[PDB]
Amino acid sequence: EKRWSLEGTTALVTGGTKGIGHAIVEELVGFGARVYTCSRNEAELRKCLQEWENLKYDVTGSVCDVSSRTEREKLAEEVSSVFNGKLNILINNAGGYVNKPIDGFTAEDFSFLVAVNLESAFHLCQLAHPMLKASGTGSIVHISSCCAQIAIPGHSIYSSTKGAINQLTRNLACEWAKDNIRTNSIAPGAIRTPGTESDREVSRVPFGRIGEPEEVASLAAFLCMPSASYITGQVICVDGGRTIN
Amino acid sequence: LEKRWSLEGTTALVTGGTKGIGHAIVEELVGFGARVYTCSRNEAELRKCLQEWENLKYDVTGSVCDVSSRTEREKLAEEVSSVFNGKLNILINNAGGYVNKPIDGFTAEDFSFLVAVNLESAFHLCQLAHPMLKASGTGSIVHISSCCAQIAIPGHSIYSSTKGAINQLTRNLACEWAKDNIRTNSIAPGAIRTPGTESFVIDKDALDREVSRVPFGRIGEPEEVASLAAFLCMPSASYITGQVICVDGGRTING
Amino acid sequence: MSLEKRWSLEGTTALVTGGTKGIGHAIVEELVGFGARVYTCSRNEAELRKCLQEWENLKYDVTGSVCDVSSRTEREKLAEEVSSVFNGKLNILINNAGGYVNKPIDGFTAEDFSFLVAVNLESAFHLCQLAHPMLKASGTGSIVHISSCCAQIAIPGHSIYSSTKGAINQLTRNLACEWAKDNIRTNSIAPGAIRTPGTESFVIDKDALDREVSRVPFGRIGEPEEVASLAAFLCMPSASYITGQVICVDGGRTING
Amino acid sequence: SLEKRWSLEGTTALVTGGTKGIGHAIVEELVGFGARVYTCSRNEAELRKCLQEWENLKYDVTGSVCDVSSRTEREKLAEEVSSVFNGKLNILINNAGGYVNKPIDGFTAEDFSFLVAVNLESAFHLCQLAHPMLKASGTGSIVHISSCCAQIAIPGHSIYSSTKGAINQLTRNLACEWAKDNIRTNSIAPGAIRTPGTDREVSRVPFGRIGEPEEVASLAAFLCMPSASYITGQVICVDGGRTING
Ligand SMILES: NC(=O)c1ccc[n+]([C@@H]2O[C@H](COP(=O)([O-])OP(=O)(O)OC[C@H]3O[C@@H](n4cnc5c(N)ncnc54)[C@H](OP(=O)(O)O)[C@@H]3O)[C@@H](O)[C@H]2O)c1
Ligand SMILES: NC(=O)c1ccc[n+]([C@@H]2O[C@H](COP(=O)([O-])OP(=O)(O)OC[C@H]3O[C@@H](n4cnc5c(N)ncnc54)[C@H](OP(=O)(O)O)[C@@H]3O)[C@@H](O)[C@H]2O)c1
Ligand SMILES: NC(=O)c1ccc[n+]([C@@H]2O[C@H](COP(=O)([O-])OP(=O)(O)OC[C@H]3O[C@@H](n4cnc5c(N)ncnc54)[C@H](OP(=O)(O)O)[C@@H]3O)[C@@H](O)[C@H]2O)c1
Ligand SMILES: NCCc1ccc(O)cc1
Ligand SMILES: NCCc1ccc(O)cc1
């Protein structure tokens, strides 16, 4: 019973107002965690917390563009204050997406994706390291993507930033193991989110369907539990078999 | 949340369930509400296990089977079908065999043994279980592979090769049987505590060598493999198929 | 040292299994083209004698004997004959001979399984064991296994075939690490679909051909010399720091999405 | 014919960071097979000495000073190469890179921005600028120099390895999107190689030694030859077995 619980744990989830992030918030709360989340949109963030606070859920938030270093430093300080410098769980879920042929990418496109997909997760880990160490039971989960192992038209820079994230998972896993912190990455296939609302792909999925947000969030919760205590440095695809055909 | 993280009402077969990882898997599955069938080659051991599991009112049945034998695998599948009335939700291929020798030392008998017990047993049991898994409407196959199928550990050549074969077979199974709502995945453990016996002396120098290469600096416990096997069989793993997941404390990526 | 030395197989000896057609025949000719003395085999005496007669008329140094590499006694014999011809020194072992059965998983019999394991995996494993003294005595050894790119993806009908080739990919890593001390390197080449006599029935099957070719970014199947060139390169002194790798020769097939 | 497939006669090539280490070996390897090479470096003095060395050995090497971490210098570099080679480039070798060895905690914003610019955005933007001449050559070959540590965790390598992992993924996207233009793209992932950039690591190499620059340059040249015509999208480690040694 204790191996499969997150009771007494504190968690930060970037980009919890919609999509996968929102499902991760609810899954973690469902298992006993206290969650701090963020978004760039005050109104929806605000709405999201009212809902959760109606429902018994200890969720806290503030507006953060995790594409801003200054903002990131800001988020980390507030998180540290709320949780008194102890954090069990960091989920780097917030990201960005640009779909263009390689010829079409601009300098702004490139810096945009690198900042929100790679530099964001990296610096937040740096910022959260003291608090994760203080937890004595740290878990970092990055939301990667399955296209970091295959070539999908238009995904070049986006997949490259996600492939950098997968490697960073390895380095975090080994460097911070001595602080009892585990790091893993979840690589989703196509998931129905507000991000993706914005036949060819599904024809390539053996299950013949796109993913649901809870099919990703459930593994995010699992990787944070005591039952996952020997799983670290892994990249796990949640794609209905999409990458292997 | 409660429906997607439960195995209530499911049926499972776990090969080699008397000790170690296999034993932890059986009890993890029962813990989440499955009815479990298990086997072993040692009858005496198996009976004791069976007699015990009752008294903690766990729903576990079993029979003696050497999974390296084709005819014994067939008889196992028929008894499992009879016990579960032709409906199997879960197949855990955990039984295997280990021999460690320099490449030059392996004989024809070694090669035959390792391939039969590690690769053919899992392949043939998948074929035999396919009708039951399909009749269940929601199937989950988990192979217990090994993280040494991605790196070279001294003495592991044929053993690791059979596990690399299992990892590939996982992908073929995931794609071919998805249409039957069957998922197939592989768990690749690293160094896991070996259950002791009254008569075998464990090589502690070999154990220390592998544990020294784990970032975590410790050996894994059987429950740390069993937990992921149960999760992979839950409704909550519905979009996870064809994967090989290392449970090794960072062993394979530790440079 | 020099570029000309590092890109040459002058003075080497090599064994290529299954050299009478397809990829194996292209490898025999590629290795001869760079100066190697080659030994080869197949199961068919008439075809092998014909190849050997052609290679003499080309003044290529190729020797051969009949060998079914799925048989343990035949492999032992082959290794004794090779060691006699090359005076116990072998620079290069190319495990090219293989076999193929295409069925749904439910369809495979015990004989199908045994056939594929013996010719794709046990043949290579045992021939590496038998060749080890000669590879070490050459002072510079190179083992190349011909695997398959479908040991990383699921192709319908390929379950046992791909699994035996995945076993080869792992064995490559063990051989690379255990025998580095003997100055032997081991690598695997993993082709996508290649035009060979082995695939001729596939190529005639126009629906099966378009299905596979639609998945290759290059829009075509490969040719035997596109595999053989890399087999030759992996055996040269220029490949001195390349060991334990699995290299796909597949026109982008496996990473295409 | 064999002799035709194993050869780079008449090809044109750009190799970034050709004044030392692997890049220097790649320049000489490519010239050795008949290529005409354009290369570059941030250091004018050493670029001069290299160009003068190669001039005195009658190699066809041209060079200009360029910092590939700067967007504008990349565009200037691309236009000079198009002019020298009359708009046709057979070969692009993205070798120039940077290294910063620190624990994850120590990396600064400049360090991160530094490594991404020189290891990732450098190659990516240069690929776009080189695309018309590579297409115009009718036979294009892009080779990135990545690193074998993009598959394992080596202490101090966290950001460096991540940029090389991004390179490895970018190779796959390039290989698939530009196969239609008869351009192939592959990555070489060296282990420890004896260079000016460079017992704990050697004890983990099965061969028990670091590599030589020509042991990387050999493969770079092979991947540009017609013999490599069906090889694209691959990441090939040149590491003496280091990544697989357990
Ligand atoms: N859905 C898929 O198919 C798929 C596949 C592979 C990977 N992924 C990855 O999964 C993660 C989530 O995607 P999703 O599809 O669930 O996205 P989504 O539905 O678009 O939700 C994104 C969430 O992130 C927040 N967010 C976005 N940018 C942010 C920023 N710069 N700072 C702070 N918060 C930010 C968004 O709110 P604001 O805009 O209000 O800030 C929103 O709450 C991403 O890393 C994505 O790359 C998704
Ligand atoms: N072609 C492809 O598309 C493809 C793709 C991936 C991998 N591969 C692999 O590449 C290798 C060569 O294939 P291929 O297409 O070139 O085959 P192929 O055209 O059929 O030629 C095979 C050669 O091997 C010989 N051979 C077969 N079995 C043998 C045995 N048991 N003992 C001795 N010799 C034997 C054959 O001659 P006899 O029959 O007369 O013995 C023939 O010389 C195989 O390992 C194959 O699995 C091929
Ligand atoms: N050697 C290894 O152990 C190893 C291992 C893995 C990967 N690698 C990779 O292999 C590649 C070469 O490494 P190396 O060790 O040969 O490095 P190196 O010896 O330090 O050589 C670097 C070369 O690149 C040039 N260069 C560096 N930054 C540049 C810039 N911004 N613009 C233009 N030129 C630049 C250098 O000249 P200036 O300073 O004059 O610009 C020099 O010519 C790098 O990508 C490295 O990441 C090397
Ligand atoms: N009993 C198998 C030996 C083994 C040890 C450690 C490891 O990571 C994988 C295999
Ligand atoms: N040699 C088996 C034939 C084959 C192999 C691989 C592939 O992708 C397609 C066909």
Side-chain angles (χ1 to χ4, degrees), chain B residues 92-103:
Chain B
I92 313 290
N93 291 119
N94 168 78
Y98 175 68
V99 182
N100 185 298
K101 293 191 179 170
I103 289 168

Side-chain angles (χ1 to χ4, degrees), chain A residues 150-151 204 242 244-245, chain C residues 153-154 215 255-257:
Chain A
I150 61 176
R204 304 287 303 122
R242 155 68 165 120
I244 53 143
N245 261 10
Chain C
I153 58 183
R215 300 291 232 97
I255 47 88
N256 193 32

